[PDB]
Write an enzyme that holds these catalytic residues in place. Structure first.
Site, PDB file in Angstrom:
ATOM      1  N   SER A  63     -45.046   2.383  21.388  1.00  0.00           N
ATOM      2  CA  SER A  63     -45.973   1.397  20.854  1.00  0.00           C
ATOM      3  C   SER A  63     -47.062   0.830  21.809  1.00  0.00           C
ATOM      4  CB  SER A  63     -45.319   0.242  20.156  1.00  0.00           C
ATOM      5  OG  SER A  63     -44.767   0.775  18.966  1.00  0.00           O
ATOM      6  N   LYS A  66     -50.552   1.743  20.934  1.00  0.00           N
ATOM      7  CA  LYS A  66     -51.365   0.821  20.130  1.00  0.00           C
ATOM      8  C   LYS A  66     -52.429   0.080  20.909  1.00  0.00           C
ATOM      9  CE  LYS A  66     -47.699   0.010  16.692  1.00  0.00           C
ATOM     10  NZ  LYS A  66     -46.718   1.028  17.106  1.00  0.00           N
ATOM     11  N   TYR A 149     -45.040  -5.789  11.136  1.00  0.00           N
ATOM     12  CA  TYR A 149     -45.336  -4.744  12.153  1.00  0.00           C
ATOM     13  C   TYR A 149     -45.169  -3.345  11.547  1.00  0.00           C
ATOM     14  CZ  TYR A 149     -45.213  -2.631  16.815  1.00  0.00           C
ATOM     15  OH  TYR A 149     -45.478  -1.945  17.954  1.00  0.00           O
ATOM     16  N   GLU A 271     -50.135  -8.496  22.313  1.00  0.00           N
ATOM     17  CA  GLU A 271     -49.722  -9.836  22.008  1.00  0.00           C
ATOM     18  C   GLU A 271     -50.198 -10.783  23.049  1.00  0.00           C
ATOM     19  OE1 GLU A 271     -45.365  -9.467  21.721  1.00  0.00           O
ATOM     20  OE2 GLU A 271     -45.530  -7.855  20.310  1.00  0.00           O
ATOM     21  N   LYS A 311     -47.013  -6.143  25.904  1.00  0.00           N
ATOM     22  CA  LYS A 311     -46.674  -5.208  24.860  1.00  0.00           C
ATOM     23  C   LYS A 311     -45.480  -4.376  25.335  1.00  0.00           C
ATOM     24  CE  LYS A 311     -47.060  -3.276  20.808  1.00  0.00           C
ATOM     25  NZ  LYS A 311     -45.556  -3.359  20.915  1.00  0.00           N
ATOM     26  N   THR A 312     -44.552  -4.221  24.418  1.00  0.00           N
ATOM     27  CA  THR A 312     -43.396  -3.320  24.608  1.00  0.00           C
ATOM     28  C   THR A 312     -43.657  -2.056  23.892  1.00  0.00           C
ATOM     29  OG1 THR A 312     -42.234  -4.183  22.660  1.00  0.00           O
ATOM     30  CG2 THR A 312     -41.787  -5.248  24.760  1.00  0.00           C
ATOM     31  N   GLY A 313     -42.979  -1.018  24.307  1.00  0.00           N
ATOM     32  CA  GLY A 313     -42.949   0.241  23.605  1.00  0.00           C
ATOM     33  C   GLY A 313     -41.675   0.986  23.845  1.00  0.00           C
ATOM     34  N   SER A 314     -41.238   1.744  22.861  1.00  0.00           N
ATOM     35  CA  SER A 314     -40.033   2.560  22.957  1.00  0.00           C
ATOM     36  C   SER A 314     -40.438   3.791  22.057  1.00  0.00           C
ATOM     37  CB  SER A 314     -38.770   1.747  22.570  1.00  0.00           C
ATOM     38  OG  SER A 314     -38.712   0.441  23.195  1.00  0.00           O
TER      39      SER A 314
END
Length: 357
Positions: A63, A66, A149, A271, A311-314
């Protein structure tokens, strides 16, 4: 103690123990402070190949992709190729006068269509199938009022940005946006000549895995990058005035908050939070209630002077977390080739960034 050593000690204290705790094969942690970059690498990019994580290691950003999508949208908007008040049918003509054509681009980018879930249905794969999905879409919640989301949502945003720039989305990034940011090892499609650098991800049983192709994958979760490139991306976010005007405006466009869900300001991709932010604020942002369910949004009625962003992503086999604080001229990137709980990313980054002299 030299400063590189200070930062290293802090990273050792706060990120390194996560490797043992969560059985994570490989990690890259970067810090940028006053335009000095510090890179820390741990463990293996491929267990079976005994290949160490290093500066050339490519990781799946999930993510965090994004953020690039958001940047591309910012670029197109500020070049007058799209307006955020446009609707998708202006660009993807087959959607003109269908119900989704009542949702504007901003609403798509920031998840407020009122009827798009986290994922497309599993059987949606081809371009025709994606088109049919959006042709057939019907409203549910009042448009613009509820955040849910969604990959389809910012996916469609990205597709429309690509149409506006007359190039497929993978080319918008690889030929326009990555080069504009000075990123040299960031990819939508990793070329054969770089596969040797593409980490395995590791699932919860530590089995090697990589991301599956998916509908509108690239704008939603499909970018892969290295630690140095992500540090350069953070530098760009911290210093957009040092970039040419078109990408400078694009980066600034992503920092603009659009609405709030309590303490979380939804910007484009990023965010945003009032700074100083407490740890709990940051953790609240990635709660199950925020990430998985719909939440009615509120107009911003308190716009802070100073902000931070994260921002996180996985993906299935990787974790990411990126954070920056303009006022402090500081930021951090974590890349792993196994997921670890988002709260452990956020806390470790919190401790490190607040302890740095």
């Amino acid at each position: 103690t030299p400063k590189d050593q200070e930062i290293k000690k802090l990273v050792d204290q706060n990120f390194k123990p996560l490797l043992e705790k969560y059985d994570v094969p490989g990690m890259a942690v970067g810090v940028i402070q006053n335009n000095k970059k510090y890179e820390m690498y741990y463990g293996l990019q491929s267990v079976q190949d005994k290949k160490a994580v290093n500066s050339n290691t490519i990781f799946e950003l999930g993510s965090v992709s994004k953020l690039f999508t958001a940047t591309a949208g910012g670029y197109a908007k500020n070049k007058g190729k799209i307006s955020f008040d446009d609707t998708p049918g202006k660009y993807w003509k087959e959607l003109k006068n269908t119900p989704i054509d009542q949702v504007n681009l901003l609403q798509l980018a920031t998840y407020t269509s009122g009827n798009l879930a986290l994922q497309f249905p599993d059987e949606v794969q081809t371009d025709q199938q994606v088109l049919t999905f959006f042709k057939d879409w019907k409203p549910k919640n009042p448009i613009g009022e509820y955040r849910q989301y969604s990959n389809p949502s910012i996916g469609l945003f990205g597709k429309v940005v690509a149409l506006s720039m007359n190039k497929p989305f993978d080319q918008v990034l690889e030929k326009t946006i990555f080069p504009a940011l000075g990123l040299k090892h960031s990819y939508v499609n990793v070329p054969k000549t770089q596969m040797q650098n593409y980490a395995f991800g590791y699932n919860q049983e530590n089995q090697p895995i990589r991301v599956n192709p998916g509908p509108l994958d690239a704008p939603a979760y499909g970018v892969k990058s290295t630690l140095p490139d992500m540090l350069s991306f953070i530098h760009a976010n911290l210093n957009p005035q040092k970039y040419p005007t078109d990408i400078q405006r694009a980066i600034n466009e992503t920092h603009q908050g659009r609405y709030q869900v309590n303490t979380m300001y939804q910007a484009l991709g990023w965010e945003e939070f009032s700074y100083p932010a407490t740890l709990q604020t940051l953790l609240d942002s990635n709660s199950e209630q925020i990430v998985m369910k719909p939440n009615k949004v509120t107009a911003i009625s308190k716009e802070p002077s100073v902000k931070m962003y994260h921002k996180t992503g996985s993906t299935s086999g990787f974790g990411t977390y990126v954070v920056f604080i303009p006022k402090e001229n500081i930021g951090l990137v974590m890349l792993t080739n196994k997921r670890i709980p988002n709260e452990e990313r956020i806390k470790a980054a919190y401790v490190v960034l607040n302890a740095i002299k």
